[PDB]
Amino acid sequence: MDGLSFVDKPDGYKNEIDQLVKKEFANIKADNSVSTLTNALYTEYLKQRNNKKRRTPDFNDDDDTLFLEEYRRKYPRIDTSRYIPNESSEVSLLGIVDSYLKHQEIVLDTLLPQTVSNQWRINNDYIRQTCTIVEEMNIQQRKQINDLEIYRKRL
Amino acid sequence: MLCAISGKVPRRPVLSPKSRTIFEKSLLEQYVKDTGNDPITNEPLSIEEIVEIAQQASLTESIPNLLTSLQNEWDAIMLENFKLRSTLDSLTKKLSTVMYERDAAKLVAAQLLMEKNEDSKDLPKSSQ
Amino acid sequence: LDSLTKKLSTVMYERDAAKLVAAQLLMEKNEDSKDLPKSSQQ
Amino acid sequence: STLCHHSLPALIEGQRKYYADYYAYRQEIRSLEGRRKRLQAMLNSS
């Protein structure tokens, strides 16, 4: 459990440790039918075919075709109507969303600081604990090698 | 600025008073109807408790609103949600490989704590 | 997703921290091994 | 979140590492207090 990351400063011993972990692992061995087609169209990954009067490019083919042509007119009048109320302001409704995107963006870069200051406030505390244990383990190892050589000289 | 259910920008945001999390009006009221609780913190919430609180620039090329815009909204929803279902099954596979090697390592530590502590004891025994 | 993404991240990091625990102890068994060899001969 | 729980596990194992060496430091002191009495008994044999 206790393994110090700061004070212990090789990639081969990681590869030496990875084999012995593996040698023990070589041993241990809500919607409707809308959910059905949205899965099925994505799995097949094929776009659904679309039919347009303009694409057909057929004029006066018969009687049904004549009805289709009308559809072109009231869409172009409505498009010119939607191009009229877009061209009325045409810069001022677009600029008020650009400032809206600026105030939304700074909040995430505000949240980028509050994590980054707090995550280093975690690592600043553990490193002090990392250096304290290495100090106590050193005096333990210093007293350990002394006793191993004292008892040999005592005998 | 955002909603805490779908990840949208709400036009009619609502605030619950039990957990301060800004969500959309139809998204908060739908959750309160199905399961009688705040979804975020799992506290009790009603429809009468919540407190009611954007400019979208249309493209100049606005039949595009019928054909080209409508399909891709249902295209980008499906191939993201299908991509997400691959992520959820793959991560639980990566969870099962995280948990197995964790138990594989602790049996090594439990086996090596028995090896080193007896060998250092045998160093204390050899002097005698 | 992000419920187990923490459970993916905390597992692999505690694995790598425990991966260092073996690497210290496998070298501590070794220094206990060769010292007992050179002394029990003499 | 990684550094949240990494400090959580490392704070408990710090005593368990130190006490295992502390108990190993007590047994080595017991030999050091035991071996010196035999050399003390040699000058009484003189």
From Swiss-Prot, chain D:
Organism, as annotated: Saccharomyces cerevisiae (strain ATCC 204508 / S288c)
Bilayer-crossing regions: none
Subunit structure: Belongs to the NTC complex (or PRP19-associated complex), composed of at least CEF1, CLF1, ISY1, NTC20, SNT309, SYF1, SYF2, and PRP19.
Similarity section: Belongs to the CEF1 family.
Record-given protein name: Pre-mRNA-splicing factor CEF1
Parent-record interval covered: 542 to 587 of 590
Lineage top rank: taxon: Eukaryota
Extra information: Present with 784 molecules/cell in log phase SD medium.
Reported function: Involved in pre-mRNA splicing and cell cycle control. Required for the binding of the NTC complex (or PRP19-associated complex) components to the spliceosome to mediate conformational rearrangement or to stabilize the structure of the spliceosome after U4 snRNA dissociation, which leads to spliceosome maturation. Its absence leads to an arrest of the cell cycle, possibly due to the inefficient splicing of TUB1.
Location(s) in or outside the cell: Cytoplasm; Nucleus
